[PDB]
Design a protein around this ligand. Structure first.
Ligand SMILES: Nc1ncnc2c1ncn2[C@@H]1O[C@H](COP(=O)(O)OP(=O)(O)O)[C@@H](O)[C@H]1O
Ligand SMILES: Nc1ncnc2c1ncn2[C@@H]1O[C@H](COP(=O)(O)OP(=O)(O)O)[C@@H](O)[C@H]1O
Ligand SMILES: Nc1ncnc2c1ncn2[C@@H]1O[C@H](COP(=O)(O)OP(=O)(O)O)[C@@H](O)[C@H]1O
Lengths: 521, 512, 521
């Protein structure tokens, strides 16, 4: 009973295939959970190498053979865009949920009954977060523990203390007036020719191309920055004429005639320089994005003017807010309205290249995080960590409530769900038990990666009880129980909230798959 | 066909190592079981290291040497045999220095023989004496075998049996203080009764059956006679049988058969004895005189079995019955009883004397429970033998191994040369003993074994071993896991001597 | 790492081989648990068919291909020798104990830790059994509930009332004044030519060989029983003589003189018959085991004696203790002191053979249960059910305590183990949980064989909670909870007691198996 070029698993083998894929994907990502976890390599085939523990990069950039596992890979892309963390632990709970469901499905239980238990435990699990969430006011010490909790899971425990104070202050630099935090206010710049621990913050923007001339000021303590988008190089005839030459010499005359289009405007830069506070103890800067001839760079440098060239559109918008000068699309209509103001503008010198820095701005409402590293892959590694550390502090401030870590919520929610009977049917009690034992994979895996026994660590933290609200978690260094609040180990509320809603939805839908049909594969 | 070169030593190592990997988990009170597939599809779930290797077939001659050396251990000491093979396999498992470093075996053997003299000295340092006069200490010592056995309900009974029994055989006046449990402590079972009825007979019990009722049933002053010759007609020098066809010659050969058997019996009864014990058999005509004399008929008693009788009742051995002087009388004997105790006759010639020998009476409710009590009591007699021969105990539970290993590692610092590397490797091999005790309990091996070595560095090395039941660390002063010294020294020598042997093999040759 | 002509399983896969065998043997025997369970056939190969649910017969008589599974079969033999019941439930708990242990062993847990939990769960489960047992007095109303509970698991729910009253009355006849009981006092006979429901009791005893003469009495309402073991057929010359003859007739004439030793002893029999109440309305019976001459039988037959010959050792044994007649090994010492007495003694004629019955005795201390059926295997099936029913009533009478059935004890003990914190070791509770889930296989299998949902039945009986002693079981006809003590379902105390001692020891020893080696296989 079948047609040619068609195949379908009518029995429960479709679940055994999907359940086997989740177990395989569980065993892969469980080794990179936490700081003690191992790293995964990402070979692009062409020879590039990239190391990272972030589950989203191991699911978005990497390729997976199993078709069913690619569905869960797309889920991590959704989990990353909403919260920014919890993609690895999301896959572990799905595998352990499906593992416990297979134990009961083999006993003749329908899949739909198990999904009803997850929906009941999930609603109870969400209420437990509201009871244990600590609405501590955001301060420096609290965010240090949060950023440390996020950055330690992506570095070698050496860049954590270095990157922690930088990531914390980056948000605080843009966090004020109770405004929604925007990550577009912080730009991430990379630099070679230095080690990894040299990462530090820059109060202002940083540009790739800088002043290239001997007669330039190495540092400008103050200047009226002029924003412009006009090229001061050889351009086409802008008047009702054209280029007509008879020889190489007559062609050179057209260059002299065409260069007059810029020579009248290069002196215009000298005019507004002398005009707006051209006396002593003053300065002037040009940030014209388009190209500039070496003549104009040579001319203006004699007047003591730092002129830049070949910048990006995004940098020009940030530069205007830092300085205040509006972009002039034509030098003919020059005025002081196109000027701004800034503090120390120096040039950072590397072994080969050099970069422009506009530090000490007045009101930029934006900063830059200067990353430095010796290798190319190490720059992409640290960049992925800072982006995860920034979203961690963003969620902590956007959502002022935080929760403990170290699997303390999972150990607590597991005991809470066990002490909770259904209200729709009795057989949902089995699905609640599967949800309880599924959450314990996180404190189980953290004991494995730290090199401790899986069963001894969980039994200690689960046996620890008292006549008061008490938290308890896994100590990755000692393996003994640990109160996360007494050490500074905190997670976000939206991460754990979206985790329960994400795992329940996907573990549900995977269990509702009754048959797998090939659509002409 | 044959083996030559480096393939031999590396091959002997894998064979000895493989035999030890079988019984790695058969160590300690939480020993693991093994499944032996019989050829007929059956299974035996034993957990005894001696029984496992006895039933396994081995092709390599190196394995036969390891097994045959373990059997020699069982005859001398019924305990610690599993530790010999594990240590011998771990000492040989370090093939880095053997072949990969291209060291000669003489360099390795010189280091293994140097460590053995150091291991022996260190064990005597951490030893401790025992007051053998106080039986309470020997009870705690002998409980190492009674523990986890059915005889725990009568644990004190087994100690008093084995303790007092070996003390009778122990003839300390000869200087060396030799003990012979096989000869001077012959054990015989008695159906009937229960485990509590088990006791020690202060004499020699012969399992001879009662052929006729005309025998002494109860006596207060026995008189036992001893002789090696048979009570039968004197045959020729050869074994030629007497073939006769003439009836007249029958009465002549018959009269010679009756008179000589008659005259020999007349001299035996002249002393008025109560039982005639002969080494050889006794024919039917000879028994007709024993039943007429109202004395018990006994035969088939070995030499040593008869030597103990002459020390018990005071009898005297004679070549033939004709030379029986008045000295051959068992005066002072306690009693002669041939009572049928439990559907089986038993000859009791007990007395109030200790003739450097005894006999253990194993009472019980059934043959299954009797055999359980039997094998459990032999080990207790051997532990009493090992303690009484050298009353010095060493801390068990892997403490003596880690204590000795710290001495070599600290002593190897002053060992200038290439021998320091294998000398230290022997120390790390001793750690396998607590490595298996911790593996069986389920606790983490690296975490506890690491802390275990640190305790021996700082704290005293005489304590802080391992608890096989709980898995945690414990002092042997707080837990009576104290084992004898003679068992550990012979266990350490046999492991090094065995490893030195297989390392000295370089060519497995065939020929006769 | 192995020698030639052998094999060794070094890693933990050797343990999985033993777990797979027990799981397979579990799925074989689970279909024949309880009355609604299916039956298994035993094809001997020669051509004999046999149907039975007794797990001891499905393991002892059925040879098992797998080597590991044959070990558990030997335990079912040992289990049947002590209590005679629970062999099937023993294997199902062993299969589930090892099943639950594999879930934790796969997580890196050592077997020795799980076995220590079973030893703790056993003691807790053994103490709880002391509280649930009912020490009421054993009456006919109670033993009927025990016999019905034991017999319905071996018959088609039609021979229940038939064999129940026979199995109960057979026991009450052989115990009074708190005397020790012995089932050997009851003889089990089998006869054909009647339907299966023709089973009934026999107060006396059945004998194989009957009388052989036309003038015999078909029934003797009263007689003195004369036990004998002398051959009344032609015997050799009893004096120191030989065969001094000259022809065949002279040899035959000496046989007459040889018969004088026997023929005169027949007169001694007739003498004591006429002396010991040889009057009207009286009788006399001889039960001589040896043969009797045809001519000598003519003498006793005309005197109204019902003689018997060529009896078995078992018949003479029960005939002595029942009737009291002492065996006379020689008619020279014939005397009336060796004579017994009995009531009705008759020979019921069947279609093919006949058997002598000696019913209506005062207190013979021995009875007989006459089974009747059309087939051979049906008689063997009923013989096994009666022996299992008698031993069940024996245990309830000897061990005056009984426990509820239908998995009510297993459900209660499992709830007690879960409500029991660790006391020997922290990780030991994982084995206690495995022991708890193992006990629930009994009500689970009863729901399967009855055709109901495995999960709905177990969840309903688990939800039954109150502020009082409440023990519910599986209703095979309804599926709902059911107080086993109310409806009349009672199990023995030694059966559940030996299950915990047998299940733990074997499940422990199989877990401690580290390697599987060939001993020259
Ligand atoms: N030192 C530590 N002690 C205890 N728990 C830790 C420690 N470091 C990280 N964790 C835990 O590891 C988990 C994973 O962290 P992270 O890598 O940021 O998310 P994910 O693993 O989902 O990408 C967190 O839930 C956190 O509680
Ligand atoms: N109760 C105990 N606690 C800790 N260790 C023990 C205990 N009993 C025995 N051992 C250790 O187990 C080892 C083996 O003991 P045993 O089984 O008597 O000898 P074998 O294993 O050679 O048969 C010994 O070296 C001893 O140190
Ligand atoms: N009305 C009845 N209702 C429910 N369960 C029953 C009933 N009679 C027997 N059982 C169950 O059947 C199981 C098996 O009984 P039995 O056949 O005597 O033992 P086994 O199957 O081990 O030989 C018992 O555990 C008992 O709980």
């Amino acid at each position: 009973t079948l047609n040619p070029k068609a195949e379908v698993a009518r029995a429960q083998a479709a679940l055994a295939v999907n359940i086997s894929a989740a177990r395989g994907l569980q065993d892969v990502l469980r080794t990179n959970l936490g700081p003690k976890g191992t790293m995964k390599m990402l070979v692009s085939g062409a020879g590039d190498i990239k190391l990272t523990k972030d589950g989203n990069v191991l699911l978005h950039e990497m390729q997976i053979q199993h078709p069913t596992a690619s569905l869960i890979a797309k889920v991590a892309t959704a989990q990353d865009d909403i919260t920014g963390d919890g993609t690895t632990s999301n896959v572990l709970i799905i595998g352990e949920l499906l593992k416990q469901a297979d134990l009961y499905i083999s006993e003749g239980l329908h899949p739909r009954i198990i999904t009803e238990g997850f929906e009941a435990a999930k609603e109870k699990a969400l209420q437990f977060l509201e009871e244990v969430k600590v609405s501590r006011e955001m301060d420096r010490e609290t965010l240090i523990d949060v950023a440390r909790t996020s950055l330690r899971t992506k570095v070698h425990a050496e860049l954590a203390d270095v990157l922690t104070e930088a990531v914390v202050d980056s948000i605080l630099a843009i966090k004020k007036q109770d405004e929604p935090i925007d990550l577009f206010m912080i730009e991430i710049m990379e630099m070679k020719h230095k080690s990894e621990t040299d990462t530090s913050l820059i109060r202002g923007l940083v540009l790739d191309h800088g002043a290239r001339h001997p007669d330039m000021k190495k540092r400008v303590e103050d200047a009226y920055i002029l924003t412009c988008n006009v090229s001061l190089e050889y351009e086409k005839t802008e008047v009702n004429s054209g280029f007509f030459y008879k020889s190489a010499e007559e062609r050179e005359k057209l260059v002299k005639a065409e260069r007059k289009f810029i020579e009248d405007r290069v002196k215009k830069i000298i005019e507004l320089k002398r005009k707006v506070c051209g006396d002593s103890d003053k300065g002037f800067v040009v940030i014209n994005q388009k190209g500039i001839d070496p003549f104009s760079l040579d001319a203006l440098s004699k007047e003591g003017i730092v002129a830049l060239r070949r910048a990006k559109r995004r940098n020009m918008e940030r530069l205007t807010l830092a300085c205040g000068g509006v972009a002039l699309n034509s030098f003919d209509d020059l005025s002081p309205d196109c000027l701004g103001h800034a503090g120390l503008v120096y040039e950072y010198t590397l072994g080969e290249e050099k970069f422009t820095f506009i530090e000490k701005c007045n009101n930029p409402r934006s900063v830059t995080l200067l990353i430095k590293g010796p290798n190319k892959h190490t720059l992409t590694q640290i960049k992925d960590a800072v982006r995860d550390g920034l979203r961690a502090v963003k969620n902590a401030i956007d959502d002022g409530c935080v929760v403990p870590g170290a699997g303390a919520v999972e150990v607590a929610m597991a005991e809470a769900l066990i002490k909770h009977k259904p209200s729709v049917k009795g057989r949902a009690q089995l699905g609640v038990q599967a949800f309880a034992d599924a959450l314990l994979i996180i404190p189980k895996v953290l004991a494995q990666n730290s090199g401790f026994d899986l069963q001894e660590t969980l039994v200690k933290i689960q046996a620890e009880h008292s006549e008061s609200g008490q938290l308890v978690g896994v100590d990755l260094n000692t393996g003994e129980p640990m109160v996360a609040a007494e050490v500074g180990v905190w997670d976000n509320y939206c991460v754990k909230k979206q985790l329960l809603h994400s795992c329940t939805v996907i573990a549900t839908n995977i269990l509702l798959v009754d048959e797998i049909m090939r659509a002409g594969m | 066909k044959r083996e030559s070169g480096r393939k031999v030593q590396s091959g002997n190592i894998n064979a000895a190592k493989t035999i030890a990997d079988i019984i790695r988990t058969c160590l300690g009170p939480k020993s693991m079981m093994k499944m032996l597939l019989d050829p007929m599809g059956g299974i035996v779930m034993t957990n005894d290291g001696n029984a496992i290797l006895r039933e396994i077939q081995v092709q390599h001659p190196a394995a036969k040497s390891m097994i045959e050396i373990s059997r020699t251990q069982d005859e001398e000491v019924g305990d610690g045999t599993t530790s010999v093979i594990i240590l011998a396999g771990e000492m040989l498992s370090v093939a880095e220095h053997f072949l990969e470093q291209q060291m000669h075996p003489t360099v390795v053997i010189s280091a293994y023989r140097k460590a053995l003299d150091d291991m022996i000295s260190t064990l005597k340092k951490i030893s401790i004496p025992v007051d053998i006069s106080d039986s309470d200490m020997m009870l705690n010592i002998i409980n190492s075998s009674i523990t986890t056995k059915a005889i725990s309900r009568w644990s004190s009974l087994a100690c008093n049996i084995a303790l007092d029994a070996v003390k009778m055989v122990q003839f300390e006046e000869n200087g060396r203080k030799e003990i012979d449990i096989k000869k001077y402590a012959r054990v015989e079972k008695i159906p009937g009764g229960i485990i509590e009825d088990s006791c020690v007979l202060r004499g020699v019990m012969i399992n001879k059956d009662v052929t006729h009722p005309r025998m002494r049933r109860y006596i207060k002053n026995p008189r036992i006679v001893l002789l090696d010759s048979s009570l039968e007609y004197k045959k020729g020098e050869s074994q030629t049988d007497i073939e006769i066809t003439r009836e007249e010659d029958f009465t002549r050969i018959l009269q010679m058969e009756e008179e000589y058997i008659q005259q020999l019996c007349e001299d035996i009864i002249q002393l008025k004895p109560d039982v005639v014990i002969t080494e050889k058999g006794i024919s039917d005509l000879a028994q007709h005189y024993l039943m007429r004399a109202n004395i018990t008929a006994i035969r088939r008693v070995r030499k040593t079995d008869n030597n103990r009788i002459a020390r018990a009742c005071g009898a005297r051995i004679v070549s033939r019955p004709e030379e029986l002087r008045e000295d051959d009388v068992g005066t002072g004997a306690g009693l002669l009883e041939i009572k049928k105790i439990g559907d089986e006759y038993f000859t009791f010639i007990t007395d109030c004397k200790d003739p450097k020998a005894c006999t253990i009476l194993l009472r019980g409710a059934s043959k299954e429970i009797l055999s359980e009590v039997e094998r459990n009591l032999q080990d207790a007699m051997q532990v009493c033998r090992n303690v009484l021969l050298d009353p010095q105990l060493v801390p068990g539970g892997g403490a003596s191994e880690m204590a000795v290993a710290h001495a070599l590692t600290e002593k190897s610092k002053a060992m200038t040369g290439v021998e320091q590397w294998p000398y230290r490797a022997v120390a790390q091999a001793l750690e396998v003993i607590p490595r298996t005790l911790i593996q069986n309990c389920g606790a983490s091996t690296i975490r506890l074994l690491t802390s275990l070595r640190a305790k021996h560095t700082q704290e005293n090395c005489e304590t802080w071993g391992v608890n096989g039941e709980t898995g945690t660390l414990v002092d042997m002063k707080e837990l009576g896991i104290w084992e004898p010294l003679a068992v550990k020294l012979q266990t350490y020598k046999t492991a090094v001597e065995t490893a030195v042997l297989l390392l000295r093999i370089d060519d497995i040759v065939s020929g006769h």
